[PDB]
Amino acid sequence: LPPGVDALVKDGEEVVKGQELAPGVVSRLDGVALYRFPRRVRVEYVKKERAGLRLPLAAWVEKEAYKPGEILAELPEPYLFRAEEEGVVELKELEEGAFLVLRREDEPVATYFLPVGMTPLVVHGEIVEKGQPLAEAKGLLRMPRQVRAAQVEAEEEGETVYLTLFLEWTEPKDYRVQPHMNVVVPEGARVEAGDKIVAAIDPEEEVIAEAEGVVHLHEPASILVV
Amino acid sequence: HEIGQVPLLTLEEEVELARKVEEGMEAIKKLSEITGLDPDLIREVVRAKILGSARVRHIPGLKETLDPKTVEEIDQKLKSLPKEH
């Protein structure tokens, strides 16, 4: 298979005459698709965590019949409040997200997330702990559709409801398998913290599993049918 | 007709095959040991089976090895061994 060419490895379940393989690869010679020589392999790592927020206090602006990919707060002139615990700003990525890590010191000092709608001023938000991050809660503040959620904890005392909930999301990734490497893992098999996946000659820097990893192989050198 | 041979041994392939062999022997070692049986003996076996039966020497030097009897005996044994082994 040319480099980058690949279509049916997750279909090593069956094969037929003239079975379409690669843009320029055919298969009249019936049987069953077989994996041969990988090179590229994706790795989604589930990432869960907890967050504390501040939304519409004396008002319901969120119902349980809600999941990943809906609105949060909405058209409140104007959400810009004063928080009181800073650290080292660090915005994370999503298909629709910019989460803030507050490494005040080495410890996890504060957690803050901003779904579509809340503008996360990066390093802006730390002098005398005044909720300096002047994010602007305005209108439909929807949530990325990539991460499920539940268990809200609303606390009424003033202007904005400090929420806390469940943040569950996956996150694809990828790595190359050189001629001397070898996948120990099979078809999208589960992976743990200490479960070595693929290896090669150099014990140095070889496929090392992690926090709940899943298998997906994409770049073969060839394929067998039998 | 060695041209009908697929000398397509790209590096990547040669390689792969290579380790697959060493390991194969290392194994034999474990085996013999994990069995108290002679290593050569083992691989000798390993062969026949892989070497198919349409190839078994009708005269293993004339009964040297009981190609049809003492053989399986070993097999079921090894097979009757724990996964790890």
Swiss-Prot record, chain A:
**Transmembrane stretches, by residue range?**
none
What's the stated role of this polypeptide? DNA-dependent RNA polymerase catalyzes the transcription of DNA into RNA using the four ribonucleoside triphosphates as substrates.
In which family does this protein belong, per the annotation? Answer: Belongs to the RNA polymerase beta' chain family.
> What is the annotated quaternary arrangement, including any partners?
The RNAP catalytic core consists of 2 alpha, 1 beta, 1 beta' and 1 omega subunit. When a sigma factor is associated with the core the holoenzyme is formed, which can initiate transcription.
Query: What is the name listed in the Swiss-Prot or TrEMBL entry for this protein?
Result: DNA-directed RNA polymerase subunit beta'
* Naturally occurring in which organism (per UniProt): Thermus thermophilus (strain ATCC 27634 / DSM 579 / HB8)
What gene is this protein translated from?
Answer: rpoC
Task: Report the portion of the entire protein shown.
Answer: 171 to 396 of 1524
